[PDB]
Amino acid sequence: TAQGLAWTPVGGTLLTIEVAAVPGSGKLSLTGQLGEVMKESAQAALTYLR
Amino acid sequence: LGKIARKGAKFWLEGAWEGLRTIDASDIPTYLGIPRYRPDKAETEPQVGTAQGLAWTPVGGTLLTIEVAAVPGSGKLSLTGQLGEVMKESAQAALTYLRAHTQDYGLPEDFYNKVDLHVHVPDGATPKDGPAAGITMATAIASALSRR
Amino acid sequence: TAQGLAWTPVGGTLLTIEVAAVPGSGKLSLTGQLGEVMKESAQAALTYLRAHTQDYGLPEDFYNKVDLHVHVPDGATPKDGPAAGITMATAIASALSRRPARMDIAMTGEVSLRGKVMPIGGVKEKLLAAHQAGIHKIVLPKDNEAQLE
Amino acid sequence: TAQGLAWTPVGGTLLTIEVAAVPGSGKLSLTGQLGEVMKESAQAALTYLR
C-alpha cells in the first residue's frame, strides 16, 4: 500500500491502495466502481512498469 | 408468557390440585401449541455451503443467512438477490487471499474460473455498514471451496 | 407443474405452480412479481439442483439455454411466509425433464441451498388448505419433527 | 382489431377499438381505471409478453 491522496466529492482523504498479487491470466480489474480515467491511469503506471 | 399464564389459569380453574404447579421444558406443548420454530442453533453442524453473520438489522441485532454456494460453474460470484456490494468486494478480498493461498488450503490451481459462487443475502441492503462478518463468509468460502 | 399450496383469505386451495422449461437464453423469469419468497428460494433450490443435474437427465447448460418462467400464483406470497420451496424444487425437477408431473398432488415445503430442507410453520393451514380443495396428498419437510407430534 | 367482448354491468356492449401498428418496446400503456384484481392481472400481463 501507498497512501493515495485525492479530492473525493465529499472532501479530502487518503485513498490508500490495497493491491493484490493474485496469480492468473494477466487480467487487470479495479474496484470502487470508479471512472475509467482510473483504469487508464493504472494502465499508464503498468505501461511504465512493463 | 401471556398464553402460558392463561393455560395455567385454565388447568387450575378445573380444580386446584396443588398450591404450586411447575412449568418446565417440553411441558409447554402440553400447555401451548406446537413449538413455533426450532430452538437456538448454537450447535448446528459442519455443513458445506454457506454462513450466517453478526450484525444489526434496523429492527434488531441479528444474524442473516448470507447464502453462498460452492457450485461448479463457469467461474464468477453470483450475488443472486440484488445484494449489497460490500459482501461482493469483501468476498473477492477473501477469495483473493484464497487465490494467494490456494496451495495452502487444498483448493484447485484455478477455481476463480472453474467454479462459481451462488451468493444470496437475506437483506437487499446491508444491515450494518461494512461487511460486519467478512471473515465469517471468508471462512465459509474457504470451507465450501475446500469441499469441506 | 407442481400444485403448490397456500393459505389464502379467499379460499383454501392449491397454488398451481407451473414453471417453464423452454429453450432460450438460459435464465429465470419473474412471474408473480414476488421475488423474496419465490425467486430467491427457487434459486437456492436450483443450487442443489445444480448438484447432480444428470441424475435427472437435466442438460447442464439449462441456465445457459433454458429460460425459466416460474409461476407461483396469487402473484406475491399468499401465506405471507416461505412455505413453498420444495414445491418449486420438484416443479423444476419435473419441468426441466420435460416430462409429465403427476396430478392430485398438492404440496408444501421449503428447501435450502445446501441439499437441506429447512423446518417450516403455517403447516396446519396447509394440511387444511389441501382438504378444502379435493386433495389428500402433501409433502412435508423432515426437520418439522414436532409437526406430527 | 379483435372482439375482446366484455359484458358491462349496466347494459351490454361489444368492447373493441380501432388499432394502430406502431411497435418497438414493451410499454403498451393505458389509464383504463382498472380494478385491483385486474391490476395484478395486468402485472402478470407484463411477463405475458414473454
From TrEMBL, chains A, D:
Mg(2+) binds at residue 5. Induction: By heat shock. Coiled coil: none annotated. Signal peptide: none annotated. It is found in: Cytoplasm. Homohexamer. Organized in a ring with a central cavity. Belongs to the peptidase S16 family. ATP-dependent serine protease that mediates the selective degradation of mutant and abnormal proteins as well as certain short-lived regulatory proteins. Required for cellular homeostasis and for survival from DNA damage and developmental changes induced by stress. Degrades polypeptides processively to yield small peptide fragments that are 5 to 10 amino acids long. Binds to DNA in a double-stranded, site-specific manner. This is Lon protease. The chain holds residues 596 to 645 of 793 of the full protein.
UniProtKB/TrEMBL annotation, chain B:
Mg(2+) binds at residues 54, 132. It is found in: Cytoplasm. The active site is at 132. Induction: By heat shock. ATP-dependent serine protease that mediates the selective degradation of mutant and abnormal proteins as well as certain short-lived regulatory proteins. Required for cellular homeostasis and for survival from DNA damage and developmental changes induced by stress. Degrades polypeptides processively to yield small peptide fragments that are 5 to 10 amino acids long. Binds to DNA in a double-stranded, site-specific manner. Homohexamer. Organized in a ring with a central cavity. Belongs to the peptidase S16 family. This is Lon protease. The gene is lonA1.
From TrEMBL, chain C:
It is found in: Cytoplasm. Induction: By heat shock. It comes from the Bacteria. Mg(2+) binds at residues 5, 83, 108. The active site is at 83, 126. Residues 1-149 form the Lon proteolytic domain. ATP-dependent serine protease that mediates the selective degradation of mutant and abnormal proteins as well as certain short-lived regulatory proteins. Required for cellular homeostasis and for survival from DNA damage and developmental changes induced by stress. Degrades polypeptides processively to yield small peptide fragments that are 5 to 10 amino acids long. Binds to DNA in a double-stranded, site-specific manner. Homohexamer. Organized in a ring with a central cavity. Belongs to the peptidase S16 family. This is Lon protease. It comes from Meiothermus taiwanensis. The chain holds residues 596 to 744 of 793 of the full protein.
